[PDB]
Each structure stands twice: as C-alpha cells, then as structure tokens.
C-alpha cells in the first residue's frame, strides 16, 4: 500500500533516524535491497529521491553528514502541521493537563 | 453502508457506532436499542458479527437484555463509556506518541 516507493523511502528514512544506518557509512546497495525481501531492482530507484534530497551521496553510497537532523526537523514540521492537531483537540474532547 | 475494512475488525467498528450514538444522546439510559436482527437485515451485516458486537457491550455493562423489551441501555453507561475512551487513550495510545515527541524535540 502507498505508491511502493515511499515504503523504501520511509524505511530508509526511519533507518537513519533509528541509527541503523549511520552517517558517512555505506548503505546497502540496489541488489541486496531488491533481494532484501523483494523489490523490482528499479523501484529501488527510491535511492533517486534521497540523492535529490541530499540524504545520501555517491564505491557504494553513504548517508550524508547532517542527514539525520535534516530529516528530523522535516518530521517535526509535518507532524506539527498535519498530525499534532486532531490529537489536541481530542485531548480536550476527553481528558487533559498531562499529569 | 458503513464504509470499512479500515484498520479495525468489523464488529469493533459497529460497536463504536453504537457507543457514539449513546454518547451523543441518541440513546439514553433505559431506552431500547435496535435488535440484532434489525441491524443485520437493515445494514446487511453478518448476524454472527452483530451478535459479537452486542455481546461485547453486554460484557461491558453498556446494555442489558430484558424480558420482552429487547436490548436496553444500562444506567450510568454514557459516563462509563467516556471514562473508558479516556482510559484506553491514556494507556494504549498516549505513550508511543510519547515517545514520538521524544524522538523529535518538543514541549
């Protein structure tokens, strides 16, 4: 579910944020990832967006330095915008004042 | 009908619709809720599932089966449900969102 491809993208993103993938270190390559469970070896080209977005760089490819922080703030923005509300605000609907 | 195959079991979605009606006041304490049979035929739901949803509400003391009257809303139910919602959110939800604003700095 989801256009594939955020599944690899997000999985990688969460991998950096969890420190499973470390800054300035080789990631897995396309073969190993397509083999990982299964993926079309292209459609593993989520490695595209991460190149574009400066998460990873070009042997092998590595997580860029400053990558995790860029991703984190990028997560705060989203969460605060599209996520934090509807919970807020449904804290008030029920019970509140963290205790 | 009631559009689903979202993340939850169908009987849980139905159970939540009856709970909402009780909380909104559409059904009050002592009042008779629709029969399992009425819900099944009307909304075209599996009777076994409907019965499962009602039994869940029985075990929770939300409703009671009565002699000739059918299924009625038990007393104190609306508040018991509100507290339940609050509690379920607190233990089974609030943390792991916690626990989120942790992973990224926050108030």
Tab-separated table of C-alpha atoms in Angstrom:
chain	number	residue	atom	x	y	z
A	1	UNK	CA	0.000	0.000	0.000
A	2	UNK	CA	1.161	3.519	-0.885
A	3	UNK	CA	2.957	4.000	-4.224
A	4	UNK	CA	5.569	1.459	-3.190
A	5	UNK	CA	8.472	3.680	-3.118
A	6	UNK	CA	7.588	5.640	-0.001
A	7	UNK	CA	7.935	2.235	1.603
A	8	UNK	CA	11.594	2.070	0.684
A	9	UNK	CA	11.944	5.823	1.120
A	10	UNK	CA	10.375	5.856	4.594
A	11	UNK	CA	12.032	2.604	5.681
A	12	UNK	CA	15.400	4.140	4.813
A	13	UNK	CA	14.439	7.448	6.430
A	14	UNK	CA	13.467	5.656	9.649
A	15	UNK	CA	16.654	3.601	9.360
A	16	UNK	CA	18.782	6.762	9.527
A	17	UNK	CA	16.683	8.219	12.331
A	18	UNK	CA	16.963	4.978	14.328
A	19	UNK	CA	20.715	4.902	13.758
A	20	UNK	CA	20.516	1.563	11.964
A	21	UNK	CA	22.095	3.422	9.083
A	22	UNK	CA	24.956	5.604	10.308
A	23	UNK	CA	26.112	8.914	8.837
A	24	UNK	CA	29.056	8.703	6.449
A	25	UNK	CA	28.705	4.934	6.089
A	26	UNK	CA	27.850	2.621	3.206
A	27	UNK	CA	24.172	1.790	2.847
A	28	UNK	CA	23.021	-1.492	1.317
A	29	UNK	CA	23.173	-1.478	-2.498
A	30	UNK	CA	20.378	-1.994	-5.028
A	31	UNK	CA	20.925	-5.750	-5.389
A	32	UNK	CA	20.846	-6.504	-1.656
A	33	UNK	CA	17.784	-4.251	-1.254
A	34	UNK	CA	15.844	-5.763	-4.155
A	35	UNK	CA	16.859	-9.098	-2.644
A	36	UNK	CA	16.092	-7.841	0.862
A	37	UNK	CA	12.613	-9.272	0.759
A	38	UNK	CA	11.607	-8.488	-2.800
A	39	UNK	CA	11.574	-5.327	-4.907
A	40	UNK	CA	11.895	-4.531	-8.597
A	41	UNK	CA	15.600	-3.504	-8.776
A	42	UNK	CA	14.262	-0.290	-10.268
A	43	UNK	CA	11.644	0.937	-7.844
A	44	UNK	CA	14.735	0.603	-5.715
A	45	UNK	CA	15.355	3.820	-7.637
A	46	UNK	CA	13.813	5.249	-4.002
A	47	UNK	CA	17.551	5.945	-3.973
A	48	UNK	CA	16.667	8.648	-6.505
A	49	UNK	CA	14.784	10.935	-4.115
A	50	UNK	CA	17.393	10.519	-1.367
A	51	UNK	CA	20.055	11.697	-3.817
A	52	UNK	CA	17.853	14.633	-4.791
A	53	UNK	CA	17.050	15.354	-1.140
A	54	UNK	CA	20.696	15.168	-0.013
A	55	UNK	CA	20.105	12.318	2.431
A	56	UNK	CA	22.643	10.111	0.652
A	57	UNK	CA	25.538	10.685	-1.759
A	58	UNK	CA	27.866	8.766	-4.057
A	59	UNK	CA	32.042	2.817	-4.410
A	60	UNK	CA	28.670	2.424	-2.746
A	61	UNK	CA	26.516	5.235	-1.427
A	62	UNK	CA	26.547	6.650	2.078
A	63	UNK	CA	24.286	8.564	4.426
A	64	UNK	CA	25.316	12.209	4.219
A	65	UNK	CA	26.539	14.041	7.307
A	66	UNK	CA	23.825	16.285	8.747
A	67	UNK	CA	21.297	13.914	7.183
A	68	UNK	CA	19.521	12.737	10.352
A	69	UNK	CA	18.930	16.265	11.627
A	70	UNK	CA	17.544	17.487	8.300
A	71	UNK	CA	15.174	14.510	8.333
A	72	UNK	CA	14.167	15.084	11.968
A	73	UNK	CA	13.191	18.739	11.579
A	74	UNK	CA	11.425	17.720	8.381
A	75	UNK	CA	9.442	15.303	10.547
A	76	UNK	CA	8.634	17.923	13.198
A	77	UNK	CA	7.228	20.261	10.547
A	78	UNK	CA	4.925	17.587	9.124
A	79	UNK	CA	3.860	16.161	12.478
A	80	UNK	CA	3.092	19.568	13.979
A	81	UNK	CA	1.189	20.597	10.837
A	82	UNK	CA	-0.786	17.524	9.745
A	83	UNK	CA	-0.508	15.339	12.842
A	84	UNK	CA	-0.232	17.105	16.201
A	85	UNK	CA	-3.679	18.575	15.667
A	86	UNK	CA	-6.690	16.224	15.587
A	87	UNK	CA	-4.976	14.902	18.735
A	88	UNK	CA	-5.091	18.245	20.564
A	89	UNK	CA	-8.016	18.797	20.323
A	90	UNK	CA	-9.361	15.346	21.097
A	91	UNK	CA	-7.177	15.576	24.189
A	92	UNK	CA	-9.580	18.349	25.190
A	93	UNK	CA	-12.531	16.278	23.979
A	94	UNK	CA	-11.662	13.682	26.640
A	95	UNK	CA	-9.048	14.394	29.373
A	96	UNK	CA	-6.130	16.774	29.645
A	97	UNK	CA	-3.355	18.535	31.561
A	98	UNK	CA	-0.619	15.892	31.326
A	99	UNK	CA	-0.159	14.619	34.815
B	1	UNK	CA	-23.293	1.138	4.103
B	2	UNK	CA	-20.889	1.790	6.933
B	3	UNK	CA	-17.682	2.057	4.937
B	4	UNK	CA	-14.951	-0.153	6.358
B	5	UNK	CA	-12.086	-2.521	6.019
B	6	UNK	CA	-10.194	0.271	7.678
B	7	UNK	CA	-7.753	-0.955	10.349
B	8	UNK	CA	-10.422	-2.486	12.640
B	9	UNK	CA	-12.480	-5.695	12.950
B	10	UNK	CA	-15.999	-5.111	11.613
B	11	UNK	CA	-17.647	-5.871	14.970
B	12	UNK	CA	-15.433	-3.237	16.583
B	13	UNK	CA	-16.500	-0.642	14.020
B	14	UNK	CA	-20.151	-1.475	14.671
B	15	UNK	CA	-19.598	-1.462	18.436
B	16	UNK	CA	-18.083	2.014	18.137
B	17	UNK	CA	-21.097	3.282	16.179
B	18	UNK	CA	-23.497	2.191	18.922
B	19	UNK	CA	-21.234	3.771	21.547
B	20	UNK	CA	-21.176	7.082	19.669
B	21	UNK	CA	-24.975	7.096	19.474
B	22	UNK	CA	-25.183	6.529	23.235
B	23	UNK	CA	-22.687	9.312	23.951
B	24	UNK	CA	-24.363	11.758	21.557
B	25	UNK	CA	-27.649	11.193	23.391
B	26	UNK	CA	-29.453	9.479	20.517
B	27	UNK	CA	-29.981	6.686	23.028
B	28	UNK	CA	-30.285	7.345	26.758
B	29	UNK	CA	-30.426	5.191	29.884
B	30	UNK	CA	-33.400	2.837	29.964
B	31	UNK	CA	-34.098	3.288	26.258
B	32	UNK	CA	-34.322	0.342	23.847
B	33	UNK	CA	-31.686	-0.030	21.125
B	34	UNK	CA	-32.409	-1.764	17.785
B	35	UNK	CA	-32.443	-5.569	17.805
B	36	UNK	CA	-29.533	-7.630	16.481
B	37	UNK	CA	-31.965	-8.759	13.789
B	38	UNK	CA	-32.933	-5.211	12.806
B	39	UNK	CA	-29.296	-4.148	12.453
B	40	UNK	CA	-28.399	-7.281	10.476
B	41	UNK	CA	-31.184	-7.075	7.882
B	42	UNK	CA	-31.126	-3.274	7.606
B	43	UNK	CA	-27.372	-2.744	7.236
B	44	UNK	CA	-26.746	-6.153	5.629
B	45	UNK	CA	-24.218	-7.329	8.221
B	46	UNK	CA	-23.308	-10.868	9.269
B	47	UNK	CA	-25.571	-11.793	12.218
B	48	UNK	CA	-22.684	-13.584	13.942
B	49	UNK	CA	-20.669	-10.354	13.826
B	50	UNK	CA	-23.580	-8.232	15.069
B	51	UNK	CA	-24.159	-10.626	17.965
B	52	UNK	CA	-20.440	-10.398	18.759
B	53	UNK	CA	-20.679	-6.604	18.902
B	54	UNK	CA	-23.724	-6.704	21.180
B	55	UNK	CA	-22.183	-9.344	23.450
B	56	UNK	CA	-19.163	-7.061	23.823
B	57	UNK	CA	-21.465	-4.281	25.008
B	58	UNK	CA	-23.221	-6.714	27.349
B	59	UNK	CA	-19.963	-7.846	28.951
B	60	UNK	CA	-19.064	-4.166	29.393
B	61	UNK	CA	-22.376	-3.434	31.118
B	62	UNK	CA	-23.248	-0.852	28.460
B	63	UNK	CA	-26.503	-2.607	27.571
B	64	UNK	CA	-28.738	-5.257	29.109
B	65	UNK	CA	-31.060	-7.838	27.584
B	66	UNK	CA	-34.531	-7.561	29.166
B	67	UNK	CA	-37.539	-9.863	29.177
B	68	UNK	CA	-39.935	-8.609	26.494
B	69	UNK	CA	-38.432	-5.172	25.968
B	70	UNK	CA	-35.397	-6.244	23.945
B	71	UNK	CA	-31.929	-4.706	24.461
B	72	UNK	CA	-31.788	-1.623	26.724
B	73	UNK	CA	-29.136	0.956	27.659
B	74	UNK	CA	-27.844	0.295	31.181
B	75	UNK	CA	-27.688	3.106	33.761
B	76	UNK	CA	-24.517	5.198	34.010
B	77	UNK	CA	-23.422	3.874	30.597
B	78	UNK	CA	-22.609	7.205	28.879
B	79	UNK	CA	-20.134	8.156	31.596
B	80	UNK	CA	-18.682	4.641	31.780
B	81	UNK	CA	-18.012	4.893	28.044
B	82	UNK	CA	-16.439	8.354	28.283
B	83	UNK	CA	-14.114	7.206	31.067
B	84	UNK	CA	-13.338	4.077	29.048
B	85	UNK	CA	-12.433	6.142	25.989
B	86	UNK	CA	-10.233	8.351	28.148
B	87	UNK	CA	-8.540	5.366	29.821
B	88	UNK	CA	-7.984	3.450	26.576
B	89	UNK	CA	-6.388	6.556	25.079
B	90	UNK	CA	-4.168	7.083	28.127
B	91	UNK	CA	-2.618	3.609	28.446
B	92	UNK	CA	-2.905	2.149	24.936
B	93	UNK	CA	-2.405	5.331	22.894
B	94	UNK	CA	-0.810	8.342	24.593
B	95	UNK	CA	2.508	6.547	25.073
B	96	UNK	CA	4.097	5.605	21.714
B	97	UNK	CA	3.043	9.108	20.746
B	98	UNK	CA	5.191	9.983	23.736
B	99	UNK	CA	7.741	8.512	22.656
B	100	UNK	CA	7.354	10.372	19.389
B	101	UNK	CA	7.777	13.965	20.565
B	102	UNK	CA	10.721	12.377	22.342
B	103	UNK	CA	12.405	11.142	19.148
B	104	UNK	CA	11.943	14.707	17.931
B	105	UNK	CA	12.336	17.513	20.455
B	106	UNK	CA	9.150	19.054	21.842
B	107	UNK	CA	7.309	20.531	24.829
